[PDB]
Design a protein around this ligand. Structure first.
Ligand SMILES: *[C@@H]1CC(=O)N(CC)C1=O
Lengths: 167, 454
């Protein structure tokens, strides 16, 4: 049986975070997505020659159910903490998301990746250096992605899987 | 059949790959094609088609059009569709009977469905209603009069804004009218679940598709556009937080075991009532960071109650696989968990393009809208059947006014619950302290079986 990784996407609502997982799961030339089927959150991939299954939980739209975050977070082995590069509040929210994850997993060393998402042509307000410094203060990788082009999407998820394998 | 020139009547333009595309299948019950995409002119032509009525397309269209067309623009388009010029005899008499009369009748049906099911467009724009009333007032014909008169009666009604015996209300330590003693352990667990189910069912039922289409509950104007949805979610959060508070604020182990055990009994009753919102409120509290770590509490919970909680927790596993099967097998009345619908609507809207391109022309992606209308339709199917339960006004009010956070902010309150958890059950190898009892009344539950015959 191939290894299965349970990944959880966490971040502020209202800033298009769902594009990260959608872009990963959909075939690169298929601009289409039906979230109501099992294939919508599972993807078989090959990372550093080792085939695995990615199971991704992204509860985008359920941010107002704030007392369900621990429940959802506890299902994951690795976390993508996502903010929008055009929304500083989403970036400032990362710190408390990471604190919650550490509390939920009861560990100061949880496989995690910081992801900065560029999803529209609104002006950038979070510079890459600010996000690189935050990621370095936590000891985690920083990946930047685009919703328009799919650039960085795979790197974000594959980096997380490497963080889990090397834990 | 000879139609007018597209230069004088835009809807006469013939169908092509550049203005209207279909899905491979047909509407299951009507044998009608399924529109995938088209220009707004083509969508408006098919919304009021001369060959046949298309009630599914009308319903889907009027629920979702605002993402691609403004209400004011839609009115203009249907007025334009109705004003059919004759082409430049037996051919004219056929055109009047087979094109004009059916098209005109279809636009009146759209107007009727619009005012009946989406009157909020008119409440939010008084000028839109002025133009509708004016347009409807200019409609002449004995064939149209009957439909015109009905639209006027709906507008006036909208401007001026059944079972057997329910079970007996259950009481435990708190007596009827003694609201000051009302609490988790003093109210009867059956009646806590019933009154929360009545509240949660009403909150679910008040949510309209206008609060969901366009993912408006996630946008900056969510408080304006999705107030009933947000109230429903905030009550749910409130109850989860109250359950967690009840638990971690009961410092004595024996009393905390009684508290957790009573919450599992409320959960059992929510499952009996098909209140899935209620089930997940409890499961969320049990899986919270402050509660989840209380091993000394969970060790003392009776095996049957552990199994009830485990089965409820399993509904959420594997992206709600078991919850989704159980909801499909239910059996209204019920209170679904809304969060799955919210995620499905948002991902449908963000994961599919608003426009499709064919031969360099932009076509509105209608199938994306259809998928959203199918979710909103599924929400609505559970909003019609009420519960046969009696409202108890004081218990209702006690649950409506619960406020476990008080004046605290979310982080502050959440840190306080977690610090209470660490105090009552320290992290190993710290020894387990003892704490004094806080409840002066009996901890024994009356159970979840009614006290008298119905
Ligand atoms: C990218 C950033 C943002 O605010 N949005 C809208 C939801 C994006 O798509």
């Amino acid at each position: 049986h191939m290894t299965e990784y349970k990944l959880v996407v966490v971040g502020a609502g209202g800033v298009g975070k769902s594009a990260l997982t959608i872009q990963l799961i959909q075939n690169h030339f298929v601009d289409e997505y039906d979230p109501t089927i099992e294939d919508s959150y599972r993807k078989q991939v090959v990372i550093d020659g080792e085939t695995c299954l990615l199971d991704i939980l992204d509860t985008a739209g359920q941010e107002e159910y704030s007392a369900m975050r621990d429940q959802y977070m506890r299902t994951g082995e690795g976390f993508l903490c996502v903010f929008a590069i055009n929304n500083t509040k989403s970036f400032e929210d990362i710190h408390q998301y990471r604190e919650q994850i550490k509390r939920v997993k009861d560990s100061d060393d949880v496989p995690m990746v910081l992801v900065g998402n560029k999803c529209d042509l609104a002006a950038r307000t979070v510079e890459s250096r600010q996000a690189q410094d935050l990621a370095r203060s936590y000891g985690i990788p920083y990946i930047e992605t685009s919703a328009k082009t799919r650039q960085g999407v795979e790197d974000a998820f594959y980096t997380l899987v490497r963080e889990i394998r090397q834990h | 059949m000879r139609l007018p020139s597209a230069d004088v009547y835009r809807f006469a333009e013939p169908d092509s790959e550049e203005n209207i595309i279909f899905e491979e299948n047909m509407q299951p019950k009507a044998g009608i094609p399924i529109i995938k995409a088209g220009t707004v002119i083509k969508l408006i032509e098919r919304l009021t088609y001369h060959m046949y009525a298309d009630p599914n397309f009308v319903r889907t269209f009027l629920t979702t059009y605002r993402s691609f067309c403004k209400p004011q623009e839609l009115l203009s388009l249907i007025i334009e569709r109705f004003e059919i010029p004759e082409p430049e005899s037996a051919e004219l008499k056929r055109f009047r009977k087979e094109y004009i009369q059916p098209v005109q009748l279809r636009v009146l049906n759209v107007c009727r469905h619009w005012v009946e099911h989406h009157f909020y467009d008119f409440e939010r724009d008084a000028y839109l209603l002025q133009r509708m009333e004016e347009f409807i007032g200019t409609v002449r014909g004995k064939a149209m009069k009957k439909w015109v008169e009905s639209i006027t009666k709906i507008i006036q009604r909208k401007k001026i804004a059944f079972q057997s015996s329910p079970p007996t209300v259950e009481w435990h330590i708190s007596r009827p009218g003694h609201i000051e003693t009302f609490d988790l352990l003093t109210l009867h667990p059956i009646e806590i679940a019933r009154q929360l189910t009545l509240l949660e069912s009403d909150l679910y039922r008040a949510v309209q598709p206008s609060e969901l289409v366009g993912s408006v509950w996630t946008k900056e104007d969510k408080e304006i556009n999705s107030p009933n949805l947000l109230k429903m979610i905030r009550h749910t959060t409130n109850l989860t937080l109250w359950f967690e508070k009840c638990i971690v604020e009961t410092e004595n182990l024996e009393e905390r075991v009684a508290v957790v055990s009573r919450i599992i009994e409320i959960l059992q009753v929510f499952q009996e009532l098909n209140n899935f919102n209620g089930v997940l409120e409890v499961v969320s509290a049990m899986n919270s960071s402050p509660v989840y770590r209380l091993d000394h509490t969970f060790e003392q919970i009776p095996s049957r109650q552990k199994k009830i909680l485990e089965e409820a927790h399993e509904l959420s596993e594997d992206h709600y696989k078991k919850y989704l099967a159980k909801l499909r097998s239910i059996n209204p009345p019920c209170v679904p968990f809304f969060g799955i619908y919210l995620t499905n609507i948002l991902k449908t809207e963000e994961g599919n393009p608003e426009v499709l391109k064919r031969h360099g022309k932009e076509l509105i992606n209608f199938s994306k809208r259809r998928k959203v209308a199918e979710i909103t339709g599924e929400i609505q199917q559970y909003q019609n059947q009420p519960y046969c339960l009696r409202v108890e006004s004081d218990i209702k009010r006690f649950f409506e006014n619960l406020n476990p956070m008080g004046n605290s902010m979310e982080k502050e309150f959440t840190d306080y619950l977690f610090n209470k958890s660490l105090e009552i059950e320290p992290r190993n190898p710290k020894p387990l302290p003892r704490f004094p009892k806080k409840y002066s009344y009996p901890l024994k539950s009356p159970g979840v079986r009614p006290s008298n015959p119905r």
